[PDB]
Design an enzyme around this catalytic site. Sequence first.
Site, PDB file in Angstrom:
ATOM      1  N   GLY A  90       0.785  -1.235   0.000  1.00  0.00           N
ATOM      2  CA  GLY A  90       0.000   0.000   0.000  1.00  0.00           C
ATOM      3  C   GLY A  90       0.820   1.290   0.000  1.00  0.00           C
ATOM      4  O   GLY A  90       2.040   1.285   0.183  1.00  0.00           O
ATOM      5  N   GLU A  91       0.117   2.395  -0.223  1.00  0.00           N
ATOM      6  CA  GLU A  91       0.694   3.723  -0.126  1.00  0.00           C
ATOM      7  C   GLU A  91       1.402   3.894   1.212  1.00  0.00           C
ATOM      8  O   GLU A  91       2.560   4.331   1.262  1.00  0.00           O
ATOM      9  CB  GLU A  91      -0.416   4.764  -0.271  1.00  0.00           C
ATOM     10  CG  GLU A  91       0.031   6.206  -0.111  1.00  0.00           C
ATOM     11  CD  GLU A  91      -0.810   7.165  -0.946  1.00  0.00           C
ATOM     12  OE1 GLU A  91      -2.059   7.017  -0.967  1.00  0.00           O
ATOM     13  OE2 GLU A  91      -0.208   8.055  -1.589  1.00  0.00           O
ATOM     14  N   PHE A  92       0.709   3.511   2.286  1.00  0.00           N
ATOM     15  CA  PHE A  92       1.188   3.713   3.651  1.00  0.00           C
ATOM     16  C   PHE A  92       1.722   2.448   4.348  1.00  0.00           C
ATOM     17  O   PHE A  92       1.972   2.467   5.564  1.00  0.00           O
ATOM     18  CB  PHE A  92       0.054   4.301   4.487  1.00  0.00           C
ATOM     19  CG  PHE A  92      -0.553   5.551   3.901  1.00  0.00           C
ATOM     20  CD1 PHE A  92      -1.619   5.473   3.018  1.00  0.00           C
ATOM     21  CD2 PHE A  92      -0.063   6.798   4.238  1.00  0.00           C
ATOM     22  CE1 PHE A  92      -2.191   6.623   2.478  1.00  0.00           C
ATOM     23  CE2 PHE A  92      -0.629   7.952   3.706  1.00  0.00           C
ATOM     24  CZ  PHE A  92      -1.697   7.860   2.824  1.00  0.00           C
ATOM     25  N   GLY A  93       1.884   1.353   3.608  1.00  0.00           N
ATOM     26  CA  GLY A  93       2.401   0.115   4.188  1.00  0.00           C
ATOM     27  C   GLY A  93       1.795  -1.136   3.589  1.00  0.00           C
ATOM     28  O   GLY A  93       1.348  -1.124   2.438  1.00  0.00           O
ATOM     29  N   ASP A 100     -11.501   2.237  -2.809  1.00  0.00           N
ATOM     30  CA  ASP A 100     -10.584   3.369  -2.895  1.00  0.00           C
ATOM     31  C   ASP A 100     -11.296   4.676  -2.579  1.00  0.00           C
ATOM     32  O   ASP A 100     -11.630   5.478  -3.476  1.00  0.00           O
ATOM     33  CB  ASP A 100      -9.883   3.393  -4.251  1.00  0.00           C
ATOM     34  CG  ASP A 100      -8.705   4.330  -4.267  1.00  0.00           C
ATOM     35  OD1 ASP A 100      -8.789   5.379  -4.931  1.00  0.00           O
ATOM     36  OD2 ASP A 100      -7.713   4.027  -3.589  1.00  0.00           O
ATOM     37  N   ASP A 155     -11.829   8.842  -8.955  1.00  0.00           N
ATOM     38  CA  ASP A 155     -10.917   7.817  -9.487  1.00  0.00           C
ATOM     39  C   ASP A 155     -11.596   6.463  -9.721  1.00  0.00           C
ATOM     40  O   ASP A 155     -11.096   5.405  -9.325  1.00  0.00           O
ATOM     41  CB  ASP A 155      -9.655   7.660  -8.610  1.00  0.00           C
ATOM     42  CG  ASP A 155      -8.476   6.958  -9.375  1.00  0.00           C
ATOM     43  OD1 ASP A 155      -8.498   6.889 -10.635  1.00  0.00           O
ATOM     44  OD2 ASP A 155      -7.546   6.455  -8.713  1.00  0.00           O
ATOM     45  N   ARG A 186      -9.406  -0.858 -11.834  1.00  0.00           N
ATOM     46  CA  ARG A 186      -8.399  -1.178 -10.801  1.00  0.00           C
ATOM     47  C   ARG A 186      -8.786  -0.845  -9.379  1.00  0.00           C
ATOM     48  O   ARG A 186      -8.169  -1.343  -8.418  1.00  0.00           O
ATOM     49  CB  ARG A 186      -7.082  -0.506 -11.117  1.00  0.00           C
ATOM     50  CG  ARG A 186      -7.162   1.026 -11.120  1.00  0.00           C
ATOM     51  CD  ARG A 186      -5.819   1.697 -11.390  1.00  0.00           C
ATOM     52  NE  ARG A 186      -6.018   3.132 -11.248  1.00  0.00           N
ATOM     53  CZ  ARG A 186      -6.582   3.903 -12.172  1.00  0.00           C
ATOM     54  NH1 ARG A 186      -6.989   3.390 -13.304  1.00  0.00           N
ATOM     55  NH2 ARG A 186      -6.764   5.196 -11.974  1.00  0.00           N
ATOM     56  N   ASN A 187      -9.814  -0.006  -9.253  1.00  0.00           N
ATOM     57  CA  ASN A 187     -10.350   0.419  -7.982  1.00  0.00           C
ATOM     58  C   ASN A 187     -11.709  -0.226  -7.655  1.00  0.00           C
ATOM     59  O   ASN A 187     -12.406   0.260  -6.780  1.00  0.00           O
ATOM     60  CB  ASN A 187     -10.487   1.942  -7.991  1.00  0.00           C
ATOM     61  CG  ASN A 187      -9.164   2.639  -7.854  1.00  0.00           C
ATOM     62  OD1 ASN A 187      -8.193   2.032  -7.367  1.00  0.00           O
ATOM     63  ND2 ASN A 187      -9.090   3.900  -8.311  1.00  0.00           N
TER      64      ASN A 187
HETATM   65  C1  7X3 Z   1      -2.744  -1.805  -2.474  1.00  0.00           C
HETATM   66  O1  7X3 Z   1      -3.036  -3.207  -2.446  1.00  0.00           O
HETATM   67  C2  7X3 Z   1      -4.315  -3.361  -1.912  1.00  0.00           C
HETATM   68  C3  7X3 Z   1      -5.133  -2.280  -1.592  1.00  0.00           C
HETATM   69  C4  7X3 Z   1      -6.393  -2.490  -1.046  1.00  0.00           C
HETATM   70  C5  7X3 Z   1      -6.850  -3.774  -0.822  1.00  0.00           C
HETATM   71  N1  7X3 Z   1      -8.125  -3.889  -0.249  1.00  0.00           N
HETATM   72  C6  7X3 Z   1      -8.924  -5.010  -0.304  1.00  0.00           C
HETATM   73  N2  7X3 Z   1     -10.095  -4.961   0.388  1.00  0.00           N
HETATM   74  C7  7X3 Z   1     -10.908  -5.992   0.385  1.00  0.00           C
HETATM   75  N3  7X3 Z   1     -10.580  -7.079  -0.314  1.00  0.00           N
HETATM   76  C8  7X3 Z   1      -9.432  -7.133  -1.014  1.00  0.00           C
HETATM   77  N4  7X3 Z   1      -9.163  -8.299  -1.723  1.00  0.00           N
HETATM   78  C9  7X3 Z   1      -8.072  -8.438  -2.598  1.00  0.00           C
HETATM   79  C10 7X3 Z   1      -7.463  -7.351  -3.260  1.00  0.00           C
HETATM   80  C11 7X3 Z   1      -6.394  -7.633  -4.127  1.00  0.00           C
HETATM   81  O2  7X3 Z   1      -5.698  -6.681  -4.818  1.00  0.00           O
HETATM   82  C12 7X3 Z   1      -6.332  -5.393  -4.959  1.00  0.00           C
HETATM   83  C13 7X3 Z   1      -5.975  -8.965  -4.319  1.00  0.00           C
HETATM   84  O3  7X3 Z   1      -4.949  -9.299  -5.165  1.00  0.00           O
HETATM   85  C14 7X3 Z   1      -3.729  -9.109  -4.428  1.00  0.00           C
HETATM   86  C15 7X3 Z   1      -6.596 -10.030  -3.677  1.00  0.00           C
HETATM   87  O4  7X3 Z   1      -6.106 -11.299  -3.945  1.00  0.00           O
HETATM   88  C16 7X3 Z   1      -6.702 -12.350  -3.152  1.00  0.00           C
HETATM   89  C17 7X3 Z   1      -7.643  -9.748  -2.830  1.00  0.00           C
HETATM   90  N5  7X3 Z   1      -8.577  -6.092  -1.025  1.00  0.00           N
HETATM   91  C18 7X3 Z   1      -6.044  -4.875  -1.138  1.00  0.00           C
HETATM   92  C19 7X3 Z   1      -4.791  -4.635  -1.674  1.00  0.00           C
HETATM   93 CL1  7X3 Z   1      -3.770  -5.934  -2.113  1.00  0.00          CL
END
Ligand code: 7X3
Length: 255
Positions: free
Chosen positions: A19-22, A149, A131, A135-136
Amino acid sequence: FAKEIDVSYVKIEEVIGAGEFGEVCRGRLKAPGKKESCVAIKTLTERQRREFLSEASIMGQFEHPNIIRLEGVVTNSMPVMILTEFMENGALDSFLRLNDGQFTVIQLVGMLRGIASGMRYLAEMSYVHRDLAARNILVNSNLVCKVSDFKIPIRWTAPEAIAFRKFTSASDAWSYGIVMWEVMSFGERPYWDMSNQDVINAIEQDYRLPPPPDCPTSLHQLMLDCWQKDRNARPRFPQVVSALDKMIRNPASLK
Ligand SMILES: COc1ccc(Nc2ncnc(Nc3cc(OC)c(OC)c(OC)c3)n2)cc1Cl
């Protein structure tokens, strides 16, 4: 905060992202009384702390099946955390790339209707996203899509939002059009091979993205409607949803 949760009720498992912050992790949330659930966990200046947590304050306002749910926050101790309902299929763009050509037009329209319902809700609550992109958007195992997001993404952004650096639900409609195009192209990048300056140049000359392969004309025309230069001419999100619901009930229109 509210949805404040004691860190003892949080089990961090696999790291799944950066992430942005970790770090972002998969894990589990066991609140006493309640059933144990599966969560994604983001972990963390006071500036940056306040910022990191603002998405929890914003996300905490919303309750809709196509808007990611805040299951909890940890702000009383370190590391600070944001817990969201776990979405097993990750980000919509990469999920569709993995499944290129493998979902039916009806399924894809169901995904798009889900996203449009999420947006109809946001606009109703006078929240502008800024945004909206594939991807979001996150996807669960039943293919339910949820808006997530909560520095301009040039290729997703309406011309007037780029020109004025101001955003409205009508500029979100433009972005939604781009998201339709991404879905029907199974996660291809918008304006594949063009730079940002090339895209703005193209849009000013009234270029619009063409129909993706195998894309019904009815869907591509709704994209073009979302991409009208006059933002007042664009359909609002209740109208986007209605238009998709028509296609669904008359699914020879999706041949
Ligand atoms: C920056 O990487 C990032 C950011 C936000 C999330 N949030 C999130 N919230 C609920 N469920 C998920 N499931 C995900 C998300 C994935 O990538 C966006 C993902 O692939 C890595 C995945 O695979 C099982 C589940 N994500 C998550 C992430 Cl990684």
